[PDB]
Amino acid sequence: DIELTKKDGTVIKLSEYGFIVNDIVIDSMQINTKYQDKENMNGRILMGSNYISRDIVVPCFCKVKNRSDIAYMRDMLYSLTTDIEPMYLREIRRKEELNYRFTQPTSDDYVKLDKNNFPDYEYSRHDQQIYVNGKQYKVIFNGVINPKQKGNKVSFELKFETTELPYGESIGTSLELEENKKVGLWSFDFNIDWHAGGDKRKYTFENLSKGTVYYHGSAPNDQFNMYKKITIILGEDTESFVWNLTHAEIMKIEGIKLKAGDRIVYDSFRVYKNGVEISTETNISQPKFKYGANKFEFNQTVQKVQFDLKFYYK
Amino acid sequence: MKNSNDRIILFRKAGEKVDATKMLFLTEYGLSHEADTDTEDTMDGSYNTGGSVESTMSGTAKMFYGDDFADEIEDAVVDRVLYEAWEVESRIPGKNGDSAKFKAKYFQGFHNKFELKAEANGIDEYEYEYGVNGRFQRGFATLPEAVTKKLKATGYRFHDTTKEDA
Predict the structure, then answer these.
(1) Which residues of A touch B43 (CB under 8 A)?
(2) Residue B117 to residue B62: CA distance in whole angstroms
(3) What whole-number distance in Å separates Cα of residue A194 and Cα of residue A178?
(4) Which of B113, B56, B110 minimizes the C-alpha distance to B84?
(5) A150 interfaces chain B, CB cutoff of 8 Å
(6) Residues 67..86 of A with a Cβ closer than 8 Å to B: which?
(7) How buried is residue A144: exposed, middle or buried, by Cβ count under 10 Å (0-12/13-18/19+)?
C-alpha cells in the first residue's frame, strides 16, 4: 500500500509524500480475440487470441493539517504521478493488519503520532511495508477526479494502464540470479532453488553441444520487446552454424563464415557478429522461452554460452 | 403557572361566512412545529440557507351527543376541505384599546388525519391531526357570543326540595 514508482531518473513512493492509499487492484490482461465465423457452421474459427493491456487501479486519499494545503497536496500528486513518461510501478503490501500495542497509562509509554495526525502502530523496524514481489510494471496514467470529503481528507482514483506489453516484468536480470550479488529483487512467487550454481539457476554453460534451461517465468518470452539477450563464444570454427531449441523455432546462420574465438551477441531478432556491424540476414528467427525446461541443442560444442533475460508473468 | 383549560380552540370552514365553532371536550392537545434545515456546507465552513417547516396540531375529543362537529371534521378529512382554525387563549386580553380580544394563533390547512376509538362501557373518543399551510399568524382575536356563553359552563345551580323544582 505505497505504490512505488521508478521513473526515468528518479524513485518515488506515495506514503513518503503524505499519501496513504486504500488499496491496489490489478486487473488481468485484456485478451483481444480474433475469431472468424464460418457462414453456416455451428462453430467459429480462432484466427488468434492475444494479451493487450493490464489496467491497474489505485484509489489514494490524503489528509493534511489545514484546508488550504489540500490544493498544494493535490498538485503535488499530479506533478508526481500523471506522467506519460513510461514509468515502472512496483506494488507494496503489508504482512499484517497492524494494531497499536499494549502500553502503560502511568504518565509514560505514551503513543506516537506520524507527521500526519495518525497513530503510529509501526513501533519496531520490522513493522513497515515491503516490496511484496520482485517485479514491476511498465505503466502510464489515465484521468482522475478529486472528490473532497470533509475536513482535510480528499480522495483520488488513479487509473493506471500498461504501456508496451501486458506482463509482470521481473526486475533484475537472470545473471543477478547467477551471481548472488544484488540482494532483494527475488520473491518467493518465483519458485527458485537455493542451490546457486546448481541446475535451474545457471545460465552460463561451457563446452557443450546441448544443455538445459529452466525459464522460471510462467509467461513466455517470445516477444522481442522483452530483454532476452544471449551471447556465445562459439568454441569451434565453422562455415555455417545451426542451433535448435524447444518451445521455439530452429535457427540457422548460413552464408557467412565465422571463427571459433569470435563471439556472437544474439539479441532479440538481432545478431551482432562481433558486437557491432550486425550481420542479421541469416534466417531471421527469434528464440522463445516458454516456461521450465527449455532445452537447447547446438551443433559443435560452443566453448561458452551465457544469456541474461527477464522473467515475465501473467 | 398556566392551566390548559384556559386555552380554547375555534374552528371554521373557510368558504363559510359564519362565526367560529368551539371544539368541546378535547382531552389532550399538541402543536408541533418541525423544521427541515435546507443547509449547504462548504468544504471550508458551514451555512444554513433556509427551512421548510412541517407544522401541525393534534387533538383528542370525546364525542358527545349534542354536537355533530366531529362529523364535519371527518367529512373534511375524507373530502379534503380547507379549514381555518385558531387557538385563542383566554385570560390574556388585549393591551392597547383592546379588551374583548384575546391572544391567539391563527392557521389554516387540511385535516390530514382523523381516527376514533371506543371500548366496552366506555365513552367513544377520537384523535385528529391537522396540517398547517405555511406559517401561522398571531393576533388578538375576539370571540363570538356563542363561545363566550359556553365558556361560563356553570353546573347544576342550587335547586330546591319537596317539588319546588326538579
Answers:
(1) 67, 148, 150
(2) 10
(3) 11
(4) B110
(5) yes
(6) 67
(7) middle
